[PDB]
PDB file of C-alpha atoms and ligand atoms in Angstrom:
ATOM      1  CA  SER Z   1       5.497 -11.639  14.317  1.00 23.36           C
ATOM      2  CA  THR Z   2       3.135  -9.415  12.345  1.00 20.52           C
ATOM      3  CA  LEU Z   3       0.783  -6.386  12.032  1.00 17.69           C
ATOM      4  CA  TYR Z   4      -1.862  -7.002  15.035  1.00 19.40           C
ATOM      5  CA  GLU Z   5       1.160  -6.893  17.353  1.00 20.01           C
ATOM      6  CA  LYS Z   6       3.324  -4.405  16.168  1.00 17.27           C
ATOM      7  CA  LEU Z   7       0.630  -1.871  16.067  1.00 14.58           C
ATOM      8  CA  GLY Z   8      -1.077  -3.167  19.666  1.00 14.51           C
ATOM      9  CA  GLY Z   9      -3.831  -5.276  18.427  1.00 12.54           C
ATOM     10  CA  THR Z  10      -7.504  -5.387  16.291  1.00 14.72           C
ATOM     11  CA  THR Z  11      -8.700  -1.655  16.986  1.00  9.76           C
ATOM     12  CA  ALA Z  12      -5.504  -0.404  16.196  1.00  8.52           C
ATOM     13  CA  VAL Z  13      -4.690  -2.107  12.986  1.00  7.73           C
ATOM     14  CA  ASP Z  14      -8.120  -1.217  12.032  1.00 10.39           C
ATOM     15  CA  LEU Z  15      -7.522   2.219  12.614  1.00 13.50           C
ATOM     16  CA  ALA Z  16      -4.471   2.205  10.727  1.00 13.43           C
ATOM     17  CA  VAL Z  17      -6.219   0.332   7.600  1.00 15.21           C
ATOM     18  CA  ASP Z  18      -9.461   2.419   7.607  1.00 16.50           C
ATOM     19  CA  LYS Z  19      -7.341   6.034   7.892  1.00 14.12           C
ATOM     20  CA  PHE Z  20      -4.883   4.746   5.145  1.00 12.99           C
ATOM     21  CA  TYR Z  21      -7.814   3.503   3.055  1.00 10.58           C
ATOM     22  CA  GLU Z  22      -9.583   6.987   3.395  1.00  8.29           C
ATOM     23  CA  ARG Z  23      -6.562   8.840   2.222  1.00  8.13           C
ATOM     24  CA  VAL Z  24      -5.810   7.034  -0.853  1.00  7.88           C
ATOM     25  CA  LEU Z  25      -9.654   6.958  -1.650  1.00  7.88           C
ATOM     26  CA  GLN Z  26      -9.331  10.960  -1.928  1.00 10.22           C
ATOM     27  CA  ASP Z  27      -6.117  11.174  -3.401  1.00 12.43           C
ATOM     28  CA  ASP Z  28      -6.934  12.280  -7.064  1.00 10.64           C
ATOM     29  CA  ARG Z  29      -3.123  11.230  -8.025  1.00 10.47           C
ATOM     30  CA  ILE Z  30      -4.204   7.369  -7.503  1.00  8.98           C
ATOM     31  CA  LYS Z  31      -7.443   6.655  -6.618  1.00  8.91           C
ATOM     32  CA  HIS Z  32      -8.327   5.795 -10.227  1.00 11.50           C
ATOM     33  CA  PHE Z  33      -6.012   2.597  -9.893  1.00  9.29           C
ATOM     34  CA  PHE Z  34      -9.035   1.394  -8.079  1.00  8.65           C
ATOM     35  CA  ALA Z  35     -11.861   2.237 -10.289  1.00  9.91           C
ATOM     36  CA  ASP Z  36     -12.398  -1.289 -11.317  1.00  6.17           C
ATOM     37  CA  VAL Z  37     -12.260  -3.029  -8.433  1.00  9.42           C
ATOM     38  CA  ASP Z  38     -15.056  -2.716  -5.333  1.00  9.74           C
ATOM     39  CA  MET Z  39     -14.430  -0.589  -2.118  1.00  9.88           C
ATOM     40  CA  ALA Z  40     -13.843  -4.098   0.108  1.00  6.68           C
ATOM     41  CA  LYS Z  41     -11.384  -5.065  -2.444  1.00  3.64           C
ATOM     42  CA  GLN Z  42     -10.118  -1.686  -2.241  1.00  3.15           C
ATOM     43  CA  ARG Z  43      -9.586  -1.561   1.399  1.00  4.70           C
ATOM     44  CA  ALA Z  44      -8.213  -4.879   1.463  1.00  4.25           C
ATOM     45  CA  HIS Z  45      -5.868  -3.524  -0.596  1.00  2.99           C
ATOM     46  CA  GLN Z  46      -4.161  -0.992   1.855  1.00  2.00           C
ATOM     47  CA  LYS Z  47      -4.475  -3.690   4.475  1.00  2.00           C
ATOM     48  CA  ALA Z  48      -1.943  -5.503   2.389  1.00  2.00           C
ATOM     49  CA  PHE Z  49       0.018  -2.566   1.397  1.00  2.00           C
ATOM     50  CA  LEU Z  50       0.299  -1.754   5.344  1.00  2.00           C
ATOM     51  CA  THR Z  51       1.379  -5.365   6.448  1.00  2.00           C
ATOM     52  CA  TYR Z  52       3.819  -5.303   4.056  1.00  2.00           C
ATOM     53  CA  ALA Z  53       5.183  -2.127   5.106  1.00  2.00           C
ATOM     54  CA  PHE Z  54       5.561  -2.868   8.655  1.00  2.00           C
ATOM     55  CA  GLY Z  55       7.560  -6.055   7.480  1.00  2.00           C
ATOM     56  CA  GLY Z  56       4.867  -9.045   6.546  1.00  2.00           C
ATOM     57  CA  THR Z  57       6.627  -9.340   3.624  1.00  2.00           C
ATOM     58  CA  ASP Z  58       6.246 -12.977   3.212  1.00  2.00           C
ATOM     59  CA  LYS Z  59       3.102 -13.408   1.821  1.00  2.00           C
ATOM     60  CA  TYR Z  60       3.691 -10.859  -1.109  1.00  2.00           C
ATOM     61  CA  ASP Z  61       6.138 -12.646  -3.315  1.00  2.00           C
ATOM     62  CA  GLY Z  62       7.801 -10.366  -5.653  1.00  2.00           C
ATOM     63  CA  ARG Z  63       6.652 -12.748  -8.496  1.00  2.00           C
ATOM     64  CA  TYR Z  64       2.946 -12.212  -6.978  1.00  2.00           C
ATOM     65  CA  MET Z  65       3.571  -8.260  -6.873  1.00  2.00           C
ATOM     66  CA  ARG Z  66       4.801  -8.255 -10.542  1.00  2.00           C
ATOM     67  CA  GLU Z  67       1.784 -10.111 -11.716  1.00  2.00           C
ATOM     68  CA  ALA Z  68      -0.497  -8.486  -9.335  1.00  2.00           C
ATOM     69  CA  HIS Z  69       0.100  -4.933 -10.476  1.00  2.00           C
ATOM     70  CA  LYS Z  70       0.490  -5.739 -14.443  1.00  2.00           C
ATOM     71  CA  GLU Z  71      -2.720  -4.320 -15.587  1.00  2.00           C
ATOM     72  CA  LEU Z  72      -1.881  -1.321 -13.577  1.00  2.00           C
ATOM     73  CA  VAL Z  73       1.193  -0.844 -15.378  1.00  2.00           C
ATOM     74  CA  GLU Z  74      -0.117  -1.794 -18.806  1.00  2.00           C
ATOM     75  CA  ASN Z  75      -3.574  -0.351 -18.632  1.00  2.00           C
ATOM     76  CA  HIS Z  76      -3.718   2.330 -16.049  1.00  2.00           C
ATOM     77  CA  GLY Z  77      -0.516   3.922 -16.685  1.00  2.00           C
ATOM     78  CA  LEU Z  78       1.274   2.950 -12.941  1.00  2.00           C
ATOM     79  CA  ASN Z  79       4.706   4.597 -12.848  1.00  2.00           C
ATOM     80  CA  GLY Z  80       6.741   5.645  -9.971  1.00  2.00           C
ATOM     81  CA  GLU Z  81       5.281   9.050  -9.172  1.00  2.00           C
ATOM     82  CA  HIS Z  82       1.921   6.802  -8.275  1.00  2.00           C
ATOM     83  CA  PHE Z  83       4.068   4.696  -6.261  1.00  2.00           C
ATOM     84  CA  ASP Z  84       5.672   7.263  -4.383  1.00  2.00           C
ATOM     85  CA  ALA Z  85       1.944   8.894  -3.916  1.00  2.00           C
ATOM     86  CA  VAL Z  86       0.620   5.895  -1.857  1.00  2.00           C
ATOM     87  CA  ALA Z  87       3.726   5.587   0.063  1.00  2.00           C
ATOM     88  CA  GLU Z  88       3.691   8.999   1.015  1.00  2.00           C
ATOM     89  CA  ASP Z  89      -0.259   8.650   1.877  1.00  2.00           C
ATOM     90  CA  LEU Z  90       0.807   5.823   4.597  1.00  2.00           C
ATOM     91  CA  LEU Z  91       3.365   7.764   5.807  1.00  2.00           C
ATOM     92  CA  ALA Z  92       1.105  10.899   6.476  1.00  2.00           C
ATOM     93  CA  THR Z  93      -1.608   8.536   7.822  1.00  2.00           C
ATOM     94  CA  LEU Z  94       0.879   6.973  10.490  1.00  2.00           C
ATOM     95  CA  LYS Z  95       2.074  10.636  11.155  1.00  2.00           C
ATOM     96  CA  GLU Z  96      -1.743  11.618  11.562  1.00  2.00           C
ATOM     97  CA  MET Z  97      -2.009   8.575  14.231  1.00  2.00           C
ATOM     98  CA  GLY Z  98       1.163   9.921  16.387  1.00  2.00           C
ATOM     99  CA  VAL Z  99       3.461   6.887  15.123  1.00  2.00           C
ATOM    100  CA  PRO Z 100       6.919   8.058  15.725  1.00  2.00           C
ATOM    101  CA  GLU Z 101       8.762   9.954  13.258  1.00  2.00           C
ATOM    102  CA  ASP Z 102      11.714   7.253  13.436  1.00  2.00           C
ATOM    103  CA  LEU Z 103       9.357   4.045  13.199  1.00  2.00           C
ATOM    104  CA  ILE Z 104       7.634   5.614  10.199  1.00  2.00           C
ATOM    105  CA  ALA Z 105      10.779   5.818   8.544  1.00  2.00           C
ATOM    106  CA  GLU Z 106      11.402   2.054   9.290  1.00  2.00           C
ATOM    107  CA  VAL Z 107       8.282   1.178   7.394  1.00  2.00           C
ATOM    108  CA  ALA Z 108       8.896   4.226   4.603  1.00  2.00           C
ATOM    109  CA  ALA Z 109      12.180   2.137   3.907  1.00  2.00           C
ATOM    110  CA  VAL Z 110      10.405  -1.115   3.502  1.00  2.00           C
ATOM    111  CA  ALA Z 111       7.211   0.221   1.384  1.00  2.00           C
ATOM    112  CA  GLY Z 112       9.394   2.155  -0.763  1.00  2.00           C
ATOM    113  CA  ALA Z 113      12.225  -0.446  -0.972  1.00  2.00           C
ATOM    114  CA  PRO Z 114      13.742  -0.589  -4.637  1.00  2.00           C
ATOM    115  CA  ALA Z 115      12.988  -4.432  -5.343  1.00  2.00           C
ATOM    116  CA  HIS Z 116       9.425  -3.975  -4.664  1.00  2.00           C
ATOM    117  CA  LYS Z 117       9.137  -0.824  -6.328  1.00  2.00           C
ATOM    118  CA  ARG Z 118      10.638  -2.463  -9.190  1.00  2.00           C
ATOM    119  CA  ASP Z 119       8.190  -5.373  -9.066  1.00  2.00           C
ATOM    120  CA  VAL Z 120       5.029  -3.266  -8.609  1.00  2.00           C
ATOM    121  CA  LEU Z 121       6.295  -1.146 -11.718  1.00  2.00           C
ATOM    122  CA  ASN Z 122       7.170  -3.956 -13.695  1.00  2.00           C
ATOM    123  CA  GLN Z 123      10.700  -2.794 -14.213  1.00  2.00           C
TER     124      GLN Z 123
HETATM  125  C1  HEM O   1       3.806  -1.929  -0.710  1.00  2.00           C
HETATM  126  C2  HEM O   1       3.563  -2.196  -1.971  1.00  2.00           C
HETATM  127  C3  HEM O   1       2.602  -3.228  -2.537  1.00  2.00           C
HETATM  128  C4  HEM O   1       2.355  -4.254  -2.028  1.00  2.00           C
HETATM  129  C5  HEM O   1       3.019  -5.297  -1.077  1.00  2.00           C
HETATM  130  C6  HEM O   1       1.228  -4.477  -2.898  1.00  2.00           C
HETATM  131  C7  HEM O   1       0.476  -5.581  -2.615  1.00  2.00           C
HETATM  132  C8  HEM O   1      -0.795  -5.967  -3.679  1.00  2.00           C
HETATM  133  C9  HEM O   1      -1.451  -7.595  -3.624  1.00  2.00           C
HETATM  134  C10 HEM O   1      -1.010  -8.871  -2.614  1.00  2.00           C
HETATM  135  C11 HEM O   1      -2.566  -7.164  -4.422  1.00  2.00           C
HETATM  136  C12 HEM O   1      -3.639  -8.482  -4.647  1.00  2.00           C
HETATM  137  C13 HEM O   1      -4.907  -8.397  -4.099  1.00  2.00           C
HETATM  138  C14 HEM O   1      -5.472  -9.688  -4.646  1.00  2.00           C
HETATM  139  O1  HEM O   1      -5.075 -10.277  -5.632  1.00  2.00           O
HETATM  140  O2  HEM O   1      -6.731  -9.811  -4.042  1.00  2.00           O
HETATM  141  C15 HEM O   1      -2.339  -6.007  -4.920  1.00  2.00           C
HETATM  142  C16 HEM O   1      -3.246  -5.735  -5.774  1.00  2.00           C
HETATM  143  C17 HEM O   1      -3.243  -4.249  -6.417  1.00  2.00           C
HETATM  144  N1  HEM O   1      -2.248  -3.263  -6.029  1.00  2.00           N
HETATM  145 FE1  HEM O   1      -0.998  -3.475  -5.221  1.00  2.00          FE
HETATM  146  N2  HEM O   1       0.647  -3.729  -3.397  1.00  2.00           N
HETATM  147  C18 HEM O   1       1.814  -2.715  -3.316  1.00  2.00           C
HETATM  148  C19 HEM O   1       1.630  -1.339  -3.904  1.00  2.00           C
HETATM  149  C20 HEM O   1       0.685  -0.583  -5.047  1.00  2.00           C
HETATM  150  C21 HEM O   1       0.716   0.527  -5.476  1.00  2.00           C
HETATM  151  C22 HEM O   1       1.614   1.669  -5.117  1.00  2.00           C
HETATM  152  C23 HEM O   1      -0.018   0.743  -6.020  1.00  2.00           C
HETATM  153  C24 HEM O   1      -0.824   1.842  -6.948  1.00  2.00           C
HETATM  154  C25 HEM O   1      -2.121   1.872  -6.855  1.00  2.00           C
HETATM  155  C26 HEM O   1      -1.021  -0.482  -5.898  1.00  2.00           C
HETATM  156  C27 HEM O   1      -2.054  -0.912  -6.804  1.00  2.00           C
HETATM  157  C28 HEM O   1      -2.878  -1.872  -6.569  1.00  2.00           C
HETATM  158  C29 HEM O   1      -4.061  -2.429  -7.442  1.00  2.00           C
HETATM  159  C30 HEM O   1      -5.076  -1.598  -8.449  1.00  2.00           C
HETATM  160  C31 HEM O   1      -4.342  -3.647  -7.268  1.00  2.00           C
HETATM  161  C32 HEM O   1      -5.748  -4.705  -7.950  1.00  2.00           C
HETATM  162  C33 HEM O   1      -6.820  -4.637  -7.220  1.00  2.00           C
HETATM  163  C34 HEM O   1      -7.727  -5.679  -7.569  1.00  2.00           C
HETATM  164  O3  HEM O   1      -7.894  -6.002  -8.670  1.00  2.00           O
HETATM  165  O4  HEM O   1      -7.933  -6.701  -6.945  1.00  2.00           O
HETATM  166  N3  HEM O   1      -0.116  -1.585  -5.086  1.00  2.00           N
HETATM  167  N4  HEM O   1      -1.160  -5.238  -4.506  1.00  2.00           N
HETATM  168  K1    K O   2      -7.629  -4.860  21.108  1.00  2.00           K
END
């Protein structure tokens, strides 16, 4: 199954989520998409994204993805350049964790997959 077991338990998951959260928070390309939400919810998001990318797709229905990002698309100007910045932040986090470049490619293909990018971007 999912995230806890793929990364190797509680501490490892928290490490991945915190590093990802940190990088995105400091990323001027995209930090503003989180301006109207609290810090706890910003981290919860990076956790969700990470879970998805590692293969916990199940709980993130495309229709829910479309709706969940609709205000970003309509109100914050969310586009593909932004989507890519977040994907790239995740992969940079996993590299900074020593995760193998092949295995980063595996999640890179998931997180950045056309049907999901299409849903997030309200294409
Ligand atoms: C792997 C791709 C992604 C998945 C699976 C995903 C999933 C989610 C989910 C499940 C929520 C809902 C949180 C909630 O309802 O409590 C959410 C919210 C959000 N996502 Fe994503 N997301 C993805 C990519 C992105 C990207 C690329 C951005 C760009 C910044 C983004 C920005 C946001 C924002 C701003 C919210 C709303 C925060 C809030 O109001 O709670 N997401 N996303
Ligand atoms: K543990």
